[PDB]
Amino acid sequence: TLWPQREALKSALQYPALAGPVFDALTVEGFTHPEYAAVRAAIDTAGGTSAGLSGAQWLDMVRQQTTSTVTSALISELGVEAIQVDDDKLPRYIAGVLARLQEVWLGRQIAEVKSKLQRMSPIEQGDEYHALFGDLVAMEAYRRSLLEQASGDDLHHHHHH
Amino acid sequence: DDKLPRYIAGVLARLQEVWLGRQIAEVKSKLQRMSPIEQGDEYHALFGDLVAMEAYRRSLLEQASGDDLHH
């Protein structure tokens, strides 16, 4: 997910209102690339997209959360680097790159819950089984929905159908 | 490059910036022929180096200007 990690950061930095609560729900651990995780953390600390800041003010606020010259320069870089997609397609593009990341993370949680359920019986473990299976249904259903959403990222200028 | 007179250090920065601008164009062209959806990891990798080149080029432009006493 390295490409959508970079695009997700650019989206949060340039269009925090579009990036929105999904972005803010993305975990730092899901940013496998260490310099990207450090930018993700700085954005979280700066208040996330909900801080309702944008533009130069937002970028400064994020840079204020880091003492790394490398992280600081990367915030500036990702704050101005073009997201290469048509303006009308930007909201679905942003949702799409965030969905890529979420999907991957949900996959891990789904696998974990399934491994727990395989050790349990729906008869002997009654209510507990219902509770954990209900958790699985919620993620599996959402994962399926994201797989459809993740399609907004196909609108990238360098992707051709 | 401190053991060089400024005008020589400057021409070498100028040489580098000109060449790198052309290489940056080469790399951008390559990226235009690759999908970040079908080849996300390769595309990201190459894009990362494009961006590093661009940043170094900007720094060489500033060094050449400084060393060559541009106004």
Swiss-Prot record, chain B:
Q: List the disulfide bonds.
A: none
The domain of life is Bacteria
Q: How does it assemble?
A: Monomer. Interacts with DnaB. Co-immunoprecipitates with DarG in the presence and absence of darT.
Q: What else is known?
A: Was identified as a high-confidence drug target.
In which family does this protein belong, per the annotation? Belongs to the DnaG primase family.
Its biological purpose is as follows:
RNA polymerase that catalyzes the synthesis of short RNA molecules used as primers for DNA polymerase during DNA replication.
Regarding domains, what does the record say? Contains an N-terminal zinc-binding domain, a central core domain that contains the primase activity, and a C-terminal DnaB-binding domain.
Put simply, this protein is called DNA primase
Say which species the protein is native to. Answer: Mycobacterium tuberculosis (strain ATCC 25618 / H37Rv)
State which gene encodes it.
dnaG
Summarize which stretch of the complete protein this chain spans. 569 to 637 of 639
